Amino acid sequence: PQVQFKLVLVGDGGTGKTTFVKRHLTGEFEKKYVATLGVEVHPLVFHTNRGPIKFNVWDTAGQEKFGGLRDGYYIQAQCAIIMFDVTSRVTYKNVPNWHRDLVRVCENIPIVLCGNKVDIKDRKVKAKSIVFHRKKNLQYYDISAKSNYNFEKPFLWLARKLIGDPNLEFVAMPALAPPEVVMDPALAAQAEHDLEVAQTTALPDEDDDL
Amino acid sequence: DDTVDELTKKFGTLTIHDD
Amino acid sequence: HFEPVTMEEDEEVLYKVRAKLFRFDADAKEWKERGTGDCKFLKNKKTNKVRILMRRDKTLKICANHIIAPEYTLKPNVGSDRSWVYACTADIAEGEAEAFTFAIRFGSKENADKFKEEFEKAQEINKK
Amino acid sequence: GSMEGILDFSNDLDIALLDQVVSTFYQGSGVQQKQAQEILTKFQDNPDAWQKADQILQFSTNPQSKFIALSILDKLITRKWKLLPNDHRIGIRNFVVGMIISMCQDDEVFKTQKNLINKSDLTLVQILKQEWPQNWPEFIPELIGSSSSSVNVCENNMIVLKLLSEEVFDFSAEQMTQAKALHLKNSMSKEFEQIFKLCFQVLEQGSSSSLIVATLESLLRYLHWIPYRYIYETNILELLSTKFMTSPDTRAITLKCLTEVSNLKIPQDNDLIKRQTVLFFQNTLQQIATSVMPVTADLKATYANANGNDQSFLQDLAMFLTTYLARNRALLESDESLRELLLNAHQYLIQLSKIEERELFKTTLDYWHNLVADLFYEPLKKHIYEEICSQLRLVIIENMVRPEEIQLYKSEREVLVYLTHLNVIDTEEIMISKLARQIDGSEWSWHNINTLSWAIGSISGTMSEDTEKRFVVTVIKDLLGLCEQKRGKDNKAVVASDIMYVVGQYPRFLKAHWNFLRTVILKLFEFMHETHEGVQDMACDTFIKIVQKCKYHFVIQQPRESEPFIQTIIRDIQKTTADLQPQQVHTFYKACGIIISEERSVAERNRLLSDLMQLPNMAWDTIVEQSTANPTLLLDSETVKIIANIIKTNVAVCTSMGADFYPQLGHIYYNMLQLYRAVSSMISAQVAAEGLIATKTPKVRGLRTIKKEILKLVETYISKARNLDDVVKVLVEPLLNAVLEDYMNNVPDARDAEVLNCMTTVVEKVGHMIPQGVILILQSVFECTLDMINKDFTEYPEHRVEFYKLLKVINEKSFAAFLELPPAAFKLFVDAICWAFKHNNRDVEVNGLQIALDLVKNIERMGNVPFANEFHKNYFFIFVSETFFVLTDSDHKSGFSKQALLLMKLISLVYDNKISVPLYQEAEVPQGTSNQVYLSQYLANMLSNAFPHLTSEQIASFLSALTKQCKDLVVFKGTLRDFLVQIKEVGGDPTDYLFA
Ligand SMILES: Nc1nc2c(ncn2[C@@H]2O[C@H](COP(=O)(O)OP(=O)(O)OP(=O)(O)O)[C@@H](O)[C@H]2O)c(=O)[nH]1
């Protein structure tokens, strides 16, 4: 769509910024931590009752050394997500810093503060200690990229504030009648090879409820 | 006592079925 | 007198089950989740063609949209008594038609076995 | 292509090439954008790039190119500034000032390129941090002077001063040394008289709301640190509270200023300041009423509609009211003229509390708590707030949340308990009549009946027993009637659950009325047969919940009952639980265990125990008899499930019975460990036959569950066991035989981390009693586990975590085991500890540093013997250097405290001369040389090589401080933090380390 808003995603390395974005792009849950070098831009469309809304998600580097442009990335951003890790005390200590550097470049934009990884039981940053967002007028959400707890909420909130309609909901995208493609022998061999390899690679997280 | 026993009897009859 | 102040309308739901769908990345040689939500078997009232339509929870974005072709075969996955894996020659969930090796996992073994029964029922319907 | 031309610095920088590379990044997409990004990142990180900054500031037209230019300057100024010549420093200062002035005069540029102006200002402030006031004493006089000439400059000077205050007072703690912080703080403080004159002048005389906002933005930042007299002994409170609350652009910031005013440090005995504090509040609430909305305005509706900045404003109003009334409400409670003000402001909070917005509600709820707490303990206060509290009761009940949301529920309960106490009659009425509105159908919904149920349940214990009795009865009667009324199986399920929920929350009533309790329990058993979603869980959750509270009334014989009710449960246990899922049964058995532990007659407890375990012990006996006669039957997946369920049933009962479980453990112990071996064989067989993929299969995962549940049962009993002599002589030796070898001799992917976990608990409770048994545990698990986890920080996360817990408790309890390690393995122990430091994972890191700390204490405690001396010769400078590596590498900042403490202990040993031998090999240093001197030299050398940009003077000064301060921990920690600043820059002041 041409209804597109730039979103800067900031926060300490390892907080799950990239994981969160990838879950929204493909549906996958990346278990590996491959640190982002600089920034990656990912177009991410949502289907609302007031038409579609695209986000240019600038997934930025939390690690100092891999910082790249740093506050350069934030220029002309129309919204943001600040991420920390509720299993890591220091990631919430650094939230004031991420915010400081964000608002200096983006004076007046909607921002969501997100405490990720609430799926883990031994939680270090307690609910009652998270009060930073109050004076700075940020929306706060406990989230989990793994369990998908409140994973829609940051984008729903921003979509309402950007479009300027608090009754904007996500809705089911249109489901076209799928084709009736007959298969040919010239691609049956590679499907047969891929299938035997797939069957003998275990499905991950087999102790999960689904 | 008196109100308690007539509660107990009402509790016994509690169901999730219509019929 | 006082004056006053998705594209599934055409389809019947044969089976509705809660599941988690994966695609196989042949390059990475690992499974990748594609979505978690209700997996529906939808019979079109016009064509009588049964398709799989699966939407992700909350976002309600399609993560599976293909015909339950009579050619397909449900194979078991090595590490799961509650999953099926099969090749799909064309799926339109992402948009552009494209093939995948899907796997789909359910709450229990019994749920999976009902899926296989309903999936085969749907295959027989698609031979018209 | 042509884009990578810019990376060639041997030619002149092509500005048009840069501007399009920059354009490609900020307006481009796909591969184009991504390639441009990597070129800007390589350009920015080029150490020479700052030289080509003044070129870009002048010649380029693109504001993004100019932004990146200042970012390259920013990196030079903070890090490599003092290394420049003196002329370059003045040259750069000049064209940063000259850029800012020229952009501010041009009204076209001042309005449109705000991002670039603010960035320039921040780049200016980074220079002040290096250069002011020592080399720029006229900066403040000159800034005040320029502010007369041009309104745009005056406004931008308020942005500079805002950022200067932020960098010095709000963000100095981490980013600069203690000494340099105090310097810059003292420097602003010394000249603030002159800055405040200009501030108050602009606020009094200015018409430009853009200039006025920026001034108030600056004021907000001043109020963090300035003395109170600047606010109270001038007109400025009248201005904030009247003039600036009327206009909507200044309202937002003024309200945030008054919020911070409310927090100022003030004399608490001066009558004039009390009237002044009262006045500004009165004025602010007056403007809200006349200019924004009246007291009666439906703030819920306004917030929901989300017009302009209404949501931010209402957030800020809540913050202002709560903050001020938390501190100052005493001032309004005495004077009868201030009574209306007090209640109006509270009535605004009541309205704000109705706003549907979770995090805002939390804020207001914190205040209600503060208040109602005060009304409960403070005398002659509650009568004031009777109408406020009554409204609050309804607000809490209608917004009450499920107990699962633990923190929000706890806060709500606390407040509602206080409100129930303050007027029990009002609370009852609001609840009873809310219930009548569920019956008459006007406010009926699944959510609405649930919230009321959670609310009614929350106030248990607060009423009198008599009131509570009458109250409960009325509620339960009404709810039972509500159930009969409602049609359909969904509706009756919702109400039944709530009926059963409320009952569970009133244990006092259940203890006093046995006939009722018995009825409730028999009804739960009926609901354990219902197949409707969530009912069985509800029935079981409710059962154990009632049992935890009323457990005494199950274990004794009531009047008019043949036997204690525990017996009557045990009899029909089969029939009661037949329809349940396996894990629902385990809860039921666990609940039965709670009751049985209450019985203090040993013979009866044991009889009840074996009676309770009748079904799982008969299933067990028939499976032992079968599977021992032919190990083939274990491949039957159905049999593996049954065995796992039997063990899980035992775990469940052992969990609630602890030490009382020993007899039931006895019945199964020897056969269970024999099963652990038979299953172990099964698993090792499938891995050879089928490959590593075997471990992912259902049948092998099933078998492994048996092992883990057997280990879990043993851990659970030993963790809670009272008779430690029996644990040693009966349980341990069989356990170590069954588990240690199997673990050692399996391939890594078949090793259960639960083995390590189990052994941790064994060493914890009886480690001291089994020195030879602990040595056996190390030999079997240590080297082979270390090898699994010493290639990366990712693989085998359970094993890794449980591994460092096991070594910790050994090092605590049975340190003798590490002495008996051969020197080569003792070397791996040390390697393993330091390896734990380098982890980001908190569970490993904390234990890593703890083990090291305890190991040092253990060696100290050995005294002046050859092992402790050989430890210091071998490992002292390893621990010091490895501790320093993680302190200074910027990637273990979570572990700073334990690192600082470990490092201080290591240094203190040499300061007190607790290391007896020399730490240097012969002929390395002069002969009669203290370890203090050689410690200073080793560290001076070590740091010189690690941080070569440091001066010799810097390193020597830091270490003088650090060693002198190795008794006081917080000062030591301070000196470390100063070192972490100075390594990030060049030319740090060595005198900074004399701060303390
Ligand atoms: N348990 C749990 N782990 C998570 C969650 N989200 C992310 N992770 C883990 O966090 C790790 C790293 O996440 P990343 O997304 O790379 O973190 P990041 O903030 O992008 O890191 P940088 O790119 O360095 O900024 C991965 O190994 C994920 O498995 C979560 O919700 N729960």
Ligand SMILES: [Mg+2]
């Ligand atoms: Mg990343």
